[PDB]
């Protein structure tokens, strides 16, 4: 491993919001693939069904277009119509309180999932521990 095995409580039986409180976005996976962050509870992109295919590995999907987040070789965060190795995440519990998604692909380069103040996604090699940008809360629905 080159992470620690600290999971978080919740499971997976119902959909979730992925609520940063770096700048208080939900995490939005648009139809064209496009992914970013939104304030707006009402958005019909935000509802994510998280499972797992591994102990501590997850798959993120948007309910609303069965799109998988996923993370590309440059590090970009988009929406993928099939699951494929860039869609599964190492979830983890962080600060003994928030969940963080390590791109499994680049786990080795500690590429996360992150939002920044301004809604727009952090390309992965400009995240690391330590920052508010990876830090999520699942909600429900």
Same mark, same amino acid.
């Given at each position: ?31 064209? #693939? ?19 295919? =591994? ?5 993120? !999907?948007?309910?609303?277009? #069965? ?7 440059? #590090? ?26 390590? =791109?499994?692909?680049?786990?080795? !380069? ?13 390309? #992965? ?6 920052? !508010? ?9």
């Amino acid at each position: 491993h080159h992470h620690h095995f600290n999971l978080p409580p919740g499971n997976y039986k119902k959909p979730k919001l992925l609520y940063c409180s770096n700048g208080g976005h939900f995490l939005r996976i648009a139809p064209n #693939g496009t992914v970013d962050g939104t304030r707006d509870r009402s958005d019909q992109h935000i509802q994510l069904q998280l499972s797992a295919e =591994s102990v501590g590995e997850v798959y993120i !999907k948007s309910t609303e277009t #069965g799109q998988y987040l996923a993370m590309d070789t440059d #590090g970009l965060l988009y929406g993928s119509q099939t699951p494929n190795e860039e869609c599964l995440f190492l979830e983890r519990l962080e600060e003994n309180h928030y969940n963080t998604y390590i =791109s499994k692909k680049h786990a080795e !380069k500690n590429w996360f999932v992150g939002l920044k103040k301004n809604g727009s996604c952090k390309r #992965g090699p400009r995240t690391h521990y330590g920052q !508010k940008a990876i830090l999520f809360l699942p909600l429900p629905v």
